[PDB]
Design a protein around this ligand. Structure first.
Ligand SMILES: Nc1nc2c(ncn2[C@@H]2O[C@H](COP(=O)(O)OP(=O)(O)NP(=O)(O)O)[C@@H](O)[C@H]2O)c(=O)[nH]1
Ligand SMILES: Nc1nc2c(ncn2[C@@H]2O[C@H](COP(=O)(O)OP(=O)(O)NP(=O)(O)O)[C@@H](O)[C@H]2O)c(=O)[nH]1
Lengths: 442, 451
């Protein structure tokens, strides 16, 4: 919002606790400090003093900190008033603070917003502030913090400076220059691949368990979860609603999706559930097939049920799992039929769940070989796509038409797209939309 | 566990926030100060420095305040660390802190005790302190029942039982070496020890895979079939979750969704409409929903406006009110107001919320959201609760290791019994208390010692 307008916001999560901290920043911070305290303590001093109400009655007691700019989180004069984790007194204090003219509850991201407006840090580091306050896995949290340290900004600045030097080479105008044009491409491709591996643990992937009713997909999902996830019984059509479960096999996220058994039933609800499952199959990154071993010995996908193979689009990895393999006595392990993985295991007994977990871990591109790395965003991937497209078009134009002006224009556009994440060229609308998603008071 | 113990705890409430506070009070305070920050900043100064680990990496960056006694909250060596309100990062930092020898996690409202008995806090509010401790302790006890609630609370049992059995066969032939019990005193004892160790790893590997905790406060929406439960859940979630139809008992399996409200997390629970079940699936789903109801935290009972104008929850369906736990807060959602036309808003009936809303269109949703946030949830939500279990089980494996190492030397059973007793004492913090008299009773019931 308005930079000149002083703002106040609650920092600590709502509820009750030992300390409820209020953060105020703006040009009215000193006047509000006098109004609520009647004095200005030494900056960066943990002073124990009471809080003063408008009528003069003691509002509360705590720790008051005064941080004159620019040696603060935002660079302006910021008052950090820590009291107690009492929401009622916090409400009264916030009302008193808002009473004074010139104060207003800043919109979410304003604390990051203004700090970004003063060029404290890279723009994408602002989003890096998020994705860490609310994570899902320990590995994801560590990667988000490492990114918050600011390595991605280093890589982006190096790439942009190399692109600027190449653009200069154009303006000023060897083979080594082409070798550099290609090795910068190689390093950018490697960093983009690592980023693709990044943000992969922000959601992991989607795996669809597909099979007929009276199969045990509900049971397999239940065993993977390790709790009582769903209802298991011999009644046909055991599950109708789409079931989603977020789990981590080993330091990695993933969403396992259950579905109703594929059969034609007069039930409208069952038909809707089948429709939902067929909708979700395409979105999923991977699909597994569960078929009873006793029902049919066929392992090729066509024999089991020729309809599903035809219906499912190609280019999607698929695996077949032989549930109830204990009754059949089949050797438990990993095999391949028609080029697709085939596992055997029994849900109720739990045998073969470990091999299923190992297959899920290994099949998806990931491993513990590389640590630290980086966590990226969809917008980052789109910007990388556009930059790579521009670079490829520029190189093709050079090779074929030898158009120096066209190559220079393509290189400049690619550099601008790459710097879009840095925010030098990004418009204010994108910054505002990104900052709005942040929680209030951040 | 003297009053001089240095304790580490979290001050900020659980959930999402921009700042997290960890406070340590005790003799080892300075030790922790040097262990985490690798130095001691200026006292009562807003120093700035990131948090480092043993490997040398950074776990968080924030503000550290060091307050030597007696001018502090508890009048002792107090350390305050402020960083980012991330549950995962907070858990990592707490795990880093706890590894130091002689440290332990604080009990419910221990800092109130420390700051009260040191005369650093006023004396008038004795009753207020008496309640502030009890409420936190009760909430902590209520938690940790979700920590040990799945397959994870299936190996530890095994473990403990195995240990008990071993102890029964190791202590007995130290107290009754005059009966005919054919004790296993031969070397095979160590063999029976090995499996116990091999069992513990399994437990330590059980919680490393599965669900993802998903801290928050539980809310349940329930009523009779076709009462708007699906519509209410879909509206609250903001995305389609369950099918919406007029068929009785459309949904048969419980559904769980997660939603944040201005930094306060909440978990919406959908269950099949309550009624008499003529099907195995329906009856089992009704039982599951009923069982989930008791463990819930907040409950919104469906009251269809079309069905009747009754407002009192007891009159609408007294049996559910009677079956409900007394402490369980209850709210009343008069569904289908848009058709009935009853004015939207917030009201009170016999002290319980009564809210008429239009679920089919979204009328009155903001009122329910306002009531939900205004309702409150102290601490001990999830991660910390399971940290206690992962710590108690942690400081038993080393005792078993050191006890087993003894057997390699002269076979002295007294030291083995001491180590096993210490290990079982540590394990008792998870399941329950196992006094010596219980071991004696099991020995009596297992053998024909008699007299
Ligand atoms: N012993 C054993 N039991 C199994 C095996 N596969 C499935 N079951 C049993 O199948 C029973 C019925 O579960 P059910 O509700 O049909 O699961 P479902 O997944 O809903 N069936 P469907 O996959 O067709 O949807 C469970 O109690 C489970 O123990 C197996 O390999 N071994
Ligand atoms: N006219 C009207 N209908 C409503 C309103 N709120 C909910 N409903 C109806 O309530 C019905 C509830 O049935 P359904 O969607 O199956 O969900 P449910 O309430 O969980 N029923 P069940 O327990 O049988 O699964 C919905 O189909 C919806 O049309 C409302 O405000 N007005």
């Amino acid at each position: 919002m308005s930079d000149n307008d002083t703002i106040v916001a609650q920092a600590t999560p709502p509820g009750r606790g030992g300390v409820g901290i209020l953060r105020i920043s703006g040009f009215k911070a000193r006047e509000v400090a006098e109004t609520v305290l009647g004095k200005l303590p030494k900056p960066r001093y943990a002073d124990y003093l009471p809080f003063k109400d408008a009528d003069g009655s003691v509002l509360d007691q705590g720790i008051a900190l005064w941080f004159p700019g620019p040696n603060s989180f935002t660079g302006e004069d910021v008052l950090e008033l820590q009291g107690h984790g009492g929401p009622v007194i916090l409400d009264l204090l916030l009302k008193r603070i808002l009473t004074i003219p010139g104060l207003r509850i800043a919109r979410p991201g304003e604390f990051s917003e203004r700090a970004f407006l003063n060029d404290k840090l890279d723009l994408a580091q602002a989003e890096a502030i998020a994705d860490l306050i609310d994570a899902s896995s320990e590995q994801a949290a560590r990667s988000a913090l490492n990114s918050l340290q600011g390595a991605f900004s280093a890589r982006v600045n190096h790439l942009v400076e190399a692109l600027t030097h190449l653009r200069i080479y154009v303006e000023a105008a060897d083979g080594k220059i082409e070798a550099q044009l290609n090795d910068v491409i190689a390093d950018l491709d490697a960093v983009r691949a690592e980023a693709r591996q990044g943000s992969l643990l922000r959601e992991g992937m989607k795996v669809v368990i597909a099979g007929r009713p009276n199969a045990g997909k509900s049971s397999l999902l239940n065993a993977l979860a390790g709790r009582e996830a769903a209802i298991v019984t011999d009644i046909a059509g055991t599950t109708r609603d789409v079931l989603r479960e977020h789990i981590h096999i080993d330091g990695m996220p993933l969403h396992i999706i259950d579905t109703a058994g594929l059969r034609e039933a007069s039930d409208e609800v069952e038909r809707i559930g089948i429709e939902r499952a067929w909708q979700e199959i395409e979105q999923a990154d991977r699909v597994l097939f569960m078929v009873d071993g006793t029902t049919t010995d066929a392992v090729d996908p066509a024999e089991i049920w020729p309809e599903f193979i035809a219906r499912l689009p190609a280019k999607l990895p698929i695996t077949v799992v032989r549930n109830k393999a204990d009754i059949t006595g089949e050797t438990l392990g990993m095999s391949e039929v028609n080029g697709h993985a085939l596992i055997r295991l029994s849900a109720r007994t739990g045998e073969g769940v470990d091999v299923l977990r190992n297959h899920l871990k290994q099949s998806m591109g990931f491993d513990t070989n590389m640590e630290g790395g980086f966590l990226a965003r969809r917008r980052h991937l789109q910007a990388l796509e556009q930059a790579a497209e521009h670079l490829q078009q520029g190189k093709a134009q050079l090779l074929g038409a030898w158009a120096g002006e066209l190559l220079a224009e393509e290189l400049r556009l690619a550099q601008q797209n790459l710097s879009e994440i840095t925010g030098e060229f990004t418009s204010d609308d994108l910054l505002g939309r990104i900052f709005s998603s942040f929680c209030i008071g951040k």
